[PDB]
Design a protein around this ligand. Structure first.
Ligand code: NA
Ligand code: NA
Lengths: 359, 360
């Protein structure tokens, strides 16, 4: 019969997403004319050094460095954590999956704290693991007491935790993280959006906690989502094995070159971050005034809104799409009641609010 | 103890090759002073349309197309196979691993036919599968009778085969392939090097063989090894599940743009292929005249040599590297007696032979 592993034959069907190019064609506008606020992308783009570097790639025909050592050296200088603790992935997505592939045998358990990033549950399913859900509270904070009780009874192997969280943007306090780190469990802290907050990265904590991994990305603040480059800090006892199991060449030459070039312009990275943080506050106030939207406070580059007053979130997202504005709506049953608006340029917010007014 | 899965605590690592920038650090030479013939890379580079497109990427800050629709439409035109059969990966390497993770439960078995590509054994180990080695005959041909016997006795789930083979360059016999396809096993045929032969791709065979996958790449003939883009033809009954399990975004915007751009210059792709095929024939006769090298006929962009006359293949490779010329040497038991020389430009061959003459 089928060659496909049984657990994968039970996966959810594929969900094709409307590319913003097709929508632009459908609406009769250029792709650049779409206001795209649905994927937490940085509309300012990366520092100018990036496209200059990508246009002058010397060795596109040669395999990349399997150790990504130039970027790791730049990240060690940037972070203050030695390169021996740092892995580079094809996005942070590769590192999430690599951790699960290297830690979870089929039937092993992980804890997830929804509502959160859908890739943790997806990767768990693909890897044959079981997810134990410990939901966050209505303010999106972790229920540490429930996490502790569940971990002690079920003895899961890992827990993935996003901070600032996707999709609401709240942060995990140091106290809560330390309490969870006392448990005999591998804690993966996803700091994808940390640069939009005033909280310091916990990369260096991996030297004191052999059950902590910290993940980061270039896809958001650094504006390189297309090029596929992320990284993480790992205890030495873990990274030795991840190096041996990692695919040799998933980090492309374009990925390594672009990330290195981005790090050469710290002023740009800081300035675009500050522009997005400033616009986050303005957008939050504007969304709060909409009678049928309840925005939540955020430390990221996006704002989650509960849709109230009997308004249909899916119809809202679709109506805005007809006007050339893309926001995030969810099919996951936990988040169907919300929409998420990414922070863009001030003119993007203005277009959004003008469209909301018409609706 | 450790969070790491037991089977990974004893994993033997892959032995990758290193790029010009790392070789420059090791050898104390600038890249222009290193002749690199160890990784089957195309020294002519990709068509000029590629660097033009890479310097003009409009949306580097937007996620790529998880469906690679533009490239798949162009690959449907190129291959004559409908796009619903075609998956794109972060190199063919991603597709090899994806197949294994979607088909092999821990403890399942694959068949390998050494000498061959070491990634099959590495990926099997990482995925917790066992490898049954059915060695090739002295001329590097498959032993189909032994493959059939082993498959019937051990019930492996997959067999990975390369044609042209890596590292000797031989072509699979079509009648042998049809015989193997009759077995209850998934056959993955890796056509990474097919463009350097006069043999047609078997992508079309997938429409009627629901246990055949055919893999291809842009990394060799097309000069895009650093950008990470390959593809394959898959039965519809298999690809439907691969779509559900695949990572969404491993294929970067630069990968998709570069592959599409390369396909816009068929004349360049043909011309560089012809230049490498021509140089392969010249390189072959030069290597054959070296008293301690026995080259084998090849249909790829590399030539395997058995090293004879008391020469240590590892020392040979290291001595040549100290003179600025990189060839491929192997540590594993099946390959330790050989070196593999990739085909470059004529001037690269000339430097290699000049350095060979200075060995002692
Ligand atoms: Na409101
Ligand atoms: Na000879």
């Amino acid at each position: 019969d089928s060659f496909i592993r049984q657990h994968l034959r039970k996966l959810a069907p594929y969900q094709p997403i409307l590319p913003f190019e097709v929508l632009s064609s459908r609406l009769g506008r250029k792709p650049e004319d779409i206001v795209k606020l649905d994927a937490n992308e940085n509309p300012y783009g990366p520092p100018p050094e990036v496209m200059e570097a990508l246009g002058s790639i010397r060795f596109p025909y040669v395999y990349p460095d399997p150790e990504s050592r130039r970027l790791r050296a730049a990240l060690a200088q940037d972070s203050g954590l030695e390169s021996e603790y740092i892995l580079v992935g094809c996005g942070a997505d590769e590192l999430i999956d690599l951790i699960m592939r290297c830690v979870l045998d089929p039937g092993d358990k992980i804890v997830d704290c929804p509502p959160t990033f859908t890739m943790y549950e997806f990767d768990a399913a693909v890897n044959g693991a079981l997810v134990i859900k410990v939901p966050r509270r209505p303010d999106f904070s972790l229920n540490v007491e429930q996490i502790i009780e569940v971990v002690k009874q079920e003895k899961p192997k890992c827990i993935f935790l996003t901070s600032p969280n996707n999709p609401d943007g709240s942060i995990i306090d140091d106290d809560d993280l330390l309490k969870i780190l006392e448990l005999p469990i591998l804690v993966v802290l996803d700091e994808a959006y940390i640069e939009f907050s005033t909280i310091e990265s916990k990369m260096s904590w991996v030297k004191k906690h052999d059950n902590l991994i910290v993940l980061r990305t270039f896809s958001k603040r650094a504006g390189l989502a297309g090029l596929r480059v992320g990284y993480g800090a790992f205890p030495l006892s873990i990274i030795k094995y991840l190096w041996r199991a990692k695919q040799p060449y998933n980090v492309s030459v374009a990925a390594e070159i672009s990330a290195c070039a981005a790090l050469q312009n710290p002023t740009y990275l800081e300035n675009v971050k500050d522009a997005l943080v400033k616009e986050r506050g303005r957008l939050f106030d504007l969304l709060k005034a909409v009678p049928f939207l309840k925005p939540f406070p955020s430390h990221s580059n996006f704002i989650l809104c509960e849709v109230t007053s009997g308004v249909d979130p899916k119809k809202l997202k679709e109506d805005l799409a007809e006007m050339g504005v893309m926001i995030r709506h969810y099919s996951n049953k936990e988040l169907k009641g919300y929409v998420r608006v990414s922070v863009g340029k001030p003119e993007h917010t203005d277009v959004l609010m003008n469209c909301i007014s018409r609706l």
